[PDB]
Amino acid sequence: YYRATAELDRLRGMLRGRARLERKVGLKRITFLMRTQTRYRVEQKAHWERAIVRKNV
Amino acid sequence: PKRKKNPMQLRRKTYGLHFKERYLKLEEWYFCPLCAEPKKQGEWCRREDCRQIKP
Amino acid sequence: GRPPPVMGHAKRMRFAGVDDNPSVTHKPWDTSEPLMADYGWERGKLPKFRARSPFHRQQIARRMVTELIRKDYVIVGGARAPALRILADHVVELAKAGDTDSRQQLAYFLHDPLMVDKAFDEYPRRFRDMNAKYAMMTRLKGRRRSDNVAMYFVEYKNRDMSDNHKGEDYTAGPERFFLPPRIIETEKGIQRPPHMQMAFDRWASKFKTEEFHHWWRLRHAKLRYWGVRNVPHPSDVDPLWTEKEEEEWHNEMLANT
Amino acid sequence: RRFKNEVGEIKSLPDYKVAVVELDSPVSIVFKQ
Amino acid sequence: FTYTQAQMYARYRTRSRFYKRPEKMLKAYNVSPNLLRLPKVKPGLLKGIYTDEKIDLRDRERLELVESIRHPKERDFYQDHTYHNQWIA
Amino acid sequence: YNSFERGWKDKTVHPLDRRGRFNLDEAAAELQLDEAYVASLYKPLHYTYSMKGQRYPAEQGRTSRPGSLAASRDRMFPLYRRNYKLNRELRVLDHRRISTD
């Protein structure tokens, strides 16, 4: 099981306090906050985002 | 303690007027004209001049 | 209402008025009594500085009064000072009255008899015209290094009307603790009552030996066994008093020669 | 006598036997400086 | 903290650092990896920790100055002996 | 404590026992009691006779240090050297007193 650490290891630089300092809590946070974006983005962002465009027109 | 505290928990410690007033306050002072040493008011030396007339 | 709102007994606080109310209990709210073992934060009680027991506190009230009389200044610390100055205004209230009731009511209280022999002689002469506030409570500045207890300098009032401490200086303590205190040079021409300065060197005589210079050497081993930082080894604690410091004083007793 | 040499091994000298003899007429040594 | 109603950025080198001190990078085979590229200028000048006097209170000179600092209540024991018999080699 | 800062000092050494300065050997001459003996009465019996006792370690004196010479327990505390004549004369049973044959 490969946590893609070197793909997240340099991106904790924009998390907040405890996540940046320690690694096994830093990854766990981002590899979740990343794991929910790319799940929010595929199935949920449109049917929200395409409702601002409908509420506008 | 059933949890460790992130800094934002340790940092709230430093906002109340209990931390500030205990550690982070500068004392008001002035130069004892007789001893030329810094001094607070209401306190004097063990010395005749400092003890007869409070500098 | 008809009964007191707070019945017979309840401790109000430090910083609270008397709020007199009909009650069976007895409260002084006045402390004109001399040399009294009424220590407390109330009104009719002098401040109870901390100690192991109201007995041991009374034992601290003895060696801190008999050392203010012995040498007119004692650098006392914390809530002992407001508790001592009221014992310096009592000793004079005991030394002024004079009757052989009082001279014992202080004899019961002082660890040493020469003090009750002193207090009754200088103080009637000294404070013949002062009628209250005989002790001056001037606070030293640097809080103790061993704890933040404050250090007040309680000294008896006017000494220029004294007979024992006429023109002494207290800007600094005696060099070896058995050496008499430095004198103001403007009044260097002062001699003392003999019974005061002949009994002193009787006491100061034991530290001028070598058996105390062994108890001095030794003590520095205790404070290291108990490890106390910054205590020189008993191998470089060369004596306080010595033969070179002998020659001056036997020739400083030229009066009896 | 025992001690630690600058290296660190405890280099204890051989043991001996103080024998305080007591002569009749006292003896002395002079040292001119 | 500090802050005099002024947003000085914060407590400087203090509050956050004292939370997880960084593990010390160990040498492999005693090698320093980029030794053969970085210059030989004394490290006092490399990252910037350039100090005019590095006074050292771990010294027999300043033993009086250390004993000047510590609190009288800070009793230190075993001044004239040690619990472990020092004469065992 | 007239210190203003307590310590291993300014702890008034004897705030009692004001009758100092005892000339023991001088007084021991009046009692005719072996001046070397009388002075031993007034120090813990560990220090003079061959008795089980507890010594402080600084009292023992250190090896020759780089800072200080070898300070033996005697040359710093002369009046604490045990006197084993005075021990034996007083405390131990001599062969003489029980010699039977």
Place this chain on the structure above:
Amino acid sequence: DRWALVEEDGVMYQVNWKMYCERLETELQKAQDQLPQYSFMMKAVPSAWKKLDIELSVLRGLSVREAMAQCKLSPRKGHMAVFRALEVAQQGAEGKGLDKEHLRIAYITCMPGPTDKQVDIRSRGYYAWKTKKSSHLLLTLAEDPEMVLPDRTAIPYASLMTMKRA
């Protein structure tokens, strides 16, 4: 001869190294001492970092004539350790040419340092290692050119609201 590459004209030059790092160690030194600063590190200040350091952030950014004052008053240990420097550092600063008066405290930071391990013997056969802590004290006296040393000879503000108007 080891060469360290430097660029001079857009191309890099295989310049000798022993002569290149002797040019740094003289330049970086000359680029550091000609400053109006004075950095001074006291080490093994016998105090933990939690304590010692929070008593520094009161001093960070104070004139040394004030810092040497706010230190001598407070009975804390952190203020007595730094005051040990502010009399030694300025004692060395005045040699560098730095002013005795206009000198400031630029950065006064605590540096985590050596930590002994002492055996502690808790009750009921449990042990827990007490670690006697010690820190390092990094102090950079800088020089403020226009710093007006305020007159401190009037009782803090007994000069008013305690003295009657006129």
Place this chain on the structure above:
RNA sequence: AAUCUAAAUAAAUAAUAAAUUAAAAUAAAAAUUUUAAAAAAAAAAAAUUAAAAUAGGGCAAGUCCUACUCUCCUUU
């Protein structure tokens, strides 16, 4: 009534996945409720989080130990 401050100093322990959520109310669905959801909106005490340790159960496989008309050797 007594003795057991704060502060200054030295600096350990259980526990620690995280928290910005935690509150609070209501329904739940397998459960005690906790979640999910909706909808809100410094110091003492021990109501909740594990304020507890550790006892209390009963089941499973494993071993233990004691007992006698029915099993079996080393057996004196």
Place this chain on the structure above:
RNA sequence: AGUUUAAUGUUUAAAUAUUUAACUAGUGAUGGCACAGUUGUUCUAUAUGUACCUAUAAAAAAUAGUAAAAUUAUUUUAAU
């Protein structure tokens, strides 16, 4: 005035201490050396025989898949 109780203590100053109740009369017993592990000793409680008697110490790979804890290398290319 050290011991059948009770309070405190509850990682405690103690891997049993502080205070205290009770008890206390031993010419028959804290004690010379003597008994040792399928066994000693037992005024017998399956109690103890060096601070859990399941003795210590030592030597094994016993069994533990039969609901214990684990079993290390992303971007794949046929289903139940």
